[PDB]
């Protein structure tokens, strides 16, 4: 291969790797645990995809399924999703937690699918269902096993035809950044917790905000990822030869070349800054990451 | 630069450039309009973005705005969207039809936005509106001017607070692949029609399907684009040196090395096959596009 490089895209122009929305924020926050077990936006610098990480941004926090619908009095319309991969290929329980791009966070999701009715005068529309993610549920979700459930309150049968769907996320309610119920209370094969880090190193976070249901609090719901989707697709598309344990990156102002911070991109696909501050530090989102050189894992960064 | 190359990704793993969904089909169809004036998914091989084309697939068929809401007996809840760019920067009328990623097709869109109420014990939810796109409307839509109107039937005022939104698309009703109403019936700066083509050449189409409202017909609603979003961001990301008018590409079975077809990627960002026939021809979506060489504009391909 050629020497590792990065796509020359400002973070504010990139796609988030865990929720399908723009990257809005670039920051470190030592009050958050630096070893999250995110399953999407996980890639090695040599292009090896980790966890449920897809190449296409469009797959992120979505699923494809053969949908079966029933009406249950006291509950409403119940959807039984037999999962497939989002390109329509067969999903085979294997060395990862779920189909590619399946949500890797917890709470209650509104999803939208194309439905088809037998009702006279009607045929195709989009139906909103409620889908429990986790962290634990009373509904035995097992996307590892290829089977998940949603439901929506309804006075009477919606008279829906069984058919192929792609569920896309409408909103989150009681978001928790912990892995969902992949397998009805049981462990599954997971990408490892992000890390390890040198003393004084913290995780660089690419941040977006999730459409929300909340009753009192207007505050936006933050979700972080280790790399924008464009860097995920770049590494997958290039299969680079990896020389060292880490690459030194300089994040620079595009106009002046002013250094904003230097950081280590570990070849396991997460970025560390040396920062000993107590609270969040945010960065400009209109800078460019430039690959300086390979450095050993033990390389000590200049503090930010 | 290095010689022009392509991201090593199968079309079926890529993101559509005109509607935020997976690429599902690869085809030619000479019965469809030959030289569409698509404004999204438009890029030169040298990296120059055309029309309203964004870098991030998440911007595709979306908009951001400062929303103002009012209730009107007879119509219900009306939204006035003062458009902003999707990174949260000011939108200024300039050398393009609309804010980046604004829909480049016609019909009636259901859109979803984050809404805030001052109703008791409610605060945050997601609200669906109807948004007329075009081709012509009685709504005086002017996204080129930074103003568009949406509405939802309501018996009472929803008591929505004015604030920032990002409109994402829920469904299409009465889809037509003609540019929407960009400037209330007036002309705007557009990317030129796709082309030109040699006599006997036809456009290569990357196809997805749009979530649909349809009372009678279950047939999925097709939408084509010239290049998957991953190719758009690749050209944007690389700023290649360009020699001739065209690059000859071979589309190949990775696993057998079978040649499925050769094609020309013109510098102006579209792919041509030599196809003599009348009706659609579809191709496998699991091949890889390989750059063979620079070739003259006038180079005659081997027919498919």
């Amino acid at each position, epitope marked *: 291969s050629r020497m590792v490089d990065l796509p020359v895209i400002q973070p504010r122009l990139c796609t988030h790797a865990r929720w399908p929305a723009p990257v809005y924020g670039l920051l470190v926050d030592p009050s958050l645990p630096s070893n999250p077990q995110w399953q999407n936006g996980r890639v090695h610098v040599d292009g090896t995809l980790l966890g449920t990480t897809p190449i296409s941004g469009s797959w992120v926090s979505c699923f494809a399924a053969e949908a079966a619908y029933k009406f249950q009095s006291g509950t409403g319309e119940v959807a039984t999703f037999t999962l497939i991969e989002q390109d329509g290929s067969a999903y085979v329980p294997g060395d990862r937690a779920a189909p590619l791009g399946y949500p890797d966070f917890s709470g209650q999701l509104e999803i939208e699918v194309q439905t088809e009715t037998t009702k006279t005068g009607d045929k195709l529309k989009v139906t909103t269902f409620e889908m429990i993610l986790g962290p634990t*549920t009373n509904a035995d979700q097992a996307p590892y096993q290829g089977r998940v459930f949603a439901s929506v309150t309804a006075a009477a049968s919606l008279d829906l035809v069984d058919g192929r769907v792609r569920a896309v996320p409408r909103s989150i309610y*009681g978001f928790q950044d912990t892995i969902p119920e992949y397998n009805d209370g049981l462990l599954v094969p997971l990408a490892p917790p992000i890390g390890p880090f040198l003393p004084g190193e913290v995780l660089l976070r690419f941040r977006t905000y999730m459409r929300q249901i909340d*009753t*009192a609090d207007a505050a936006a719901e933050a979700i972080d990822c280790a790399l924008p989707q464009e860097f995920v697709s770049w590494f997958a598309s290039n299969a680079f030869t990896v020389q060292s344990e880490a690459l030194l990156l300089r994040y620079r102002n595009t106009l002046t070349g002013q250094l904003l911070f230097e950081c280590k991109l570990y070849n396991e696909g997460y970025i560390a800054l040396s920062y000993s501050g107590s609270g969040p530090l945010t960065f400009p989102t209109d800078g460019i990451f430039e690959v300086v050189s390979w450095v050993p894992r033990l390389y000590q960064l200049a503090s930010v | 630069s290095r010689m022009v190359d392509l991201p090593v990704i199968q079309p079926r793993l890529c993101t559509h450039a005109r509607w935020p969904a997976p690429v599902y089909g690869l085809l030619v169809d000479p019965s469809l309009p030959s030289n569409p004036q698509w404004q999204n998914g438009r890029v030169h091989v040298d990296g120059t973005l055309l029309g309203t084309t964004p870098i991030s697939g998440s911007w595709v068929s979306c908009f951001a705005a400062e929303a103002a809401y009012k209730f009107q007996s007879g119509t219900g809840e009306v939204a006035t969207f003062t458009l902003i760019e999707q990174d949260g920067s000011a939108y200024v009328p300039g050398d393009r039809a609309a804010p980046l990623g604004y829909p480049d097709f016609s019909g009636q869109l259901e859109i979803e936005v984050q809404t805030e109420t001052t109703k008791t014990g409610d605060k945050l939810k997601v609200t669906t509106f109807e948004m007329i796109l075009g081709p012509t409307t009685n709504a005086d839509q002017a996204p080129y001017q930074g103003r568009v109107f949406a509405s939802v039937t309501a018996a009472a005022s929803l008591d929505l607070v004015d604030g920032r939104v990002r409109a994402v698309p829920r469904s299409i009703y009465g889809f037509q692949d003609t540019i929407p109403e960009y400037n209330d019936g007036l002309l705007v700066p557009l990317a030129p029609p796709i082309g030109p083509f040699l006599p006997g050449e036809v456009l290569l189409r990357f196809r997805t399907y749009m979530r649909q409202i349809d009372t009678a017909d279950a047939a999925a609603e097709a939408i084509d684009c010239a290049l998957p979003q991953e190719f758009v961001s690749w050209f944007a990301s690389n700023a290649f040196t360009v020699q001739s008018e065209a690059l000859l590409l071979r589309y190949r079975n990775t696993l057998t090395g079978q040649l499925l077809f050769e094609c020309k990627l013109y510098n102006e960002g579209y792919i041509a096959l030599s196809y003599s026939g009348s009706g659609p021809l579809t191709f496998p979506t699991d091949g890889i596009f390989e750059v063979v060489s620079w070739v003259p504009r006038l180079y005659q391909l081997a027919s498919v």
Partner: nanobody
Amino acid sequence: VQLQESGGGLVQAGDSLRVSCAASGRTISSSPMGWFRQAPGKEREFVAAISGNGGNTYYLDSVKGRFTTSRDNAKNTVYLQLNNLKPEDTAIYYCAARSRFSAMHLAYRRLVDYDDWGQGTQVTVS
């Protein structure tokens, strides 16, 4: 499930009361439980909730530090302790159970989130 409330009553501002929501017919040990209050003539509004697994609680801002809820699985009963009462707390207090599909960490906040309701108990603050 059937929900039978008791407690409530009349006290002066700054005094405290208890509402007990005793379940019969089925266990609430894994049921998300909610508290709403309604002054007749006004709409029913959220006060407090406890998640299915009993590990998360959420309170209306204006009552946080004053009201607490806990569930006693042995007695199949959810409790609302109203401390430091104000006239503006004057209402019928309702408990509610969610029986459908649940995220078990989630303190469910909305009327549309619950399935079974108690008859209510009156709290009056002078």
